[PDB]
Design a binder for these strands. Sequence first.
DNA 1: CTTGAATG
DNA 2: CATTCAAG
DNA 3: CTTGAATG
DNA 4: CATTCAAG
Lengths: 255, 255
Amino acid sequence: TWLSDFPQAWAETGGMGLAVRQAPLIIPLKATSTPVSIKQYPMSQEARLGIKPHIQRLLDQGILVPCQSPWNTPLLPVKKPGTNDYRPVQDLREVNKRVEDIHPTVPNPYNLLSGLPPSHQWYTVLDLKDAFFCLRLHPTSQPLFAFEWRDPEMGISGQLTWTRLPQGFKNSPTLFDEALHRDLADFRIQHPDLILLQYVDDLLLAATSELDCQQGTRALLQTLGNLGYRASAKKAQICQKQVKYLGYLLKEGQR
Amino acid sequence: TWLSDFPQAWAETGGMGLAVRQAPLIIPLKATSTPVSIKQYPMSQEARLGIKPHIQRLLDQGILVPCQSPWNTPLLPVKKPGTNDYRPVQDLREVNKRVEDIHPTVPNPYNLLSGLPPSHQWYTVLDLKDAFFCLRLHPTSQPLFAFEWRDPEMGISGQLTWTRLPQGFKNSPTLFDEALHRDLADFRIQHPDLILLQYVDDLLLAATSELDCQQGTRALLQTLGNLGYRASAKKAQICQKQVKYLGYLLKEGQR
DNA sequence: CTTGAATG
DNA sequence: CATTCAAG
DNA sequence: CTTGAATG
DNA sequence: CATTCAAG
Ligand SMILES: N=C(N)c1ccc(Oc2ccc(-c3nc4cc(C(=N)N)ccc4[nH]3)cc2)cc1
Ligand SMILES: N=C(N)c1ccc(Oc2ccc(-c3nc4cc(C(=N)N)ccc4[nH]3)cc2)cc1
């Protein structure tokens, strides 16, 4: 009943996250960058109706807010199964090109897994839901990610932008990984015997026994919830001898 | 009047050459080679009539002879200006593939020219006419180069082959260059002060003065004629301060 | 004419 | 993968 | 829909 | 140089 013991740590019961200890992120531009405003290609009504619910939800959550900005990038309608199930995908390539590069600090899965001792075979895998959205963007950097939004007949003035780290931004994975490392530094210190692997929003906790794993998981969930992050209860793999992590199947200490 | 003083050395007056000091060449095949007989693609009457005179001339010269061989490669009709001026071109690629490779001993023009001292600025350039044809092919190797020949209505039985080193054969340049080097070895020894460069059928004689060049040229022409080779009187550049050799313009010792 | 390599 | 070039 | 890279 | 893939 981990779902009930840690209501705040799960996406299904704690609501949208917000990393309260992390200062709003400022995104430095390259020395010669000037705003670029790309025209929004006309979107069919089908695509707009498919996207609308997502946009409204983000607006209600305060993740998207109205704005007037010199920057503008196109929104794209992306589906998968049939001509249904849409979801907003912003093409931030022209923005990415104008943002100063940062060093890629996220380890590749292969090297990350090398830090898992055979002594720790009790695993717990958690994936953080809407991880990037948990990190606030400083108001000065918000205008950079603006896009146009029109309702199938009459909607908001013109542009909308993100108040949190957006999908499609080249530095989101690295900035998120670095932010969570800062937030989980104390947890690591308070649990010397535990092994914690972080790959952006995918976490692997390893303990020597089933007890230390349940104790560790309880503490990690409590810490994450308190910090403002949210894990997927649905996909969560708690205290298992075998788990799926980063495309690998961890079993008998293999891999 | 070099044309009259050396009748035997010029192609225009000495007739078709024949390297009398060189033993008929035997062409070794690769260890696993077996004869290949490629069908002759039908040739238009236009092409056949264009080729016929050349074939008859070679037959009269004994350069081509009738034969029955397990080997056969295609003859091609090649023209240049208009739909006129034809000339037989044999595709010996399938034969080349089955012949043992030999080391490429012909120097590249750049390196060959490095052996020309500034002290020798009186040049003479001669190109040997139908050079390969001057080298006999041993009867055992003649069948290898056979091709089919049909007259525009009624001609020779079937196949014809070469009795001399043929054009299109991968080793002809090297074998010719090596043969002429053997034949001109004594000339080099008898004329220590002369510079002689050989690039297959293109010869460059260099002397310190105009006299040594005329003396040297006279001796070279006499030697070549006696050996059975023939130079082009038309293209000959005798005792000049400036000459064209291997695409270069030799002048003032430059190049 | 058929082959291979070099370009679009 | 379709054309162009080069070559025998 | 637009971009670049990878394939034919 | 025309298609296909991948991605934002
Ligand atoms: N698809 C198309 N419309 C086109 C595709 C390619 C085009 O141009 C060219 C095609 C081929 C060459 C070219 N091909 C070769 C082959 C060589 C060899 N291997 N002997 C040696 C040198 C050489 N140059 C040069 C230019 C023109 C049009
Ligand atoms: N001209 C034609 N008829 C055809 C030409 C090419 C064909 O196939 C293919 C085309 C393209 C790919 C292919 N393209 C990419 C791009 C990648 C990237 N840069 N992100 C990463 C991986 C990748 N695989 C794989 C196969 C099929 C037909």
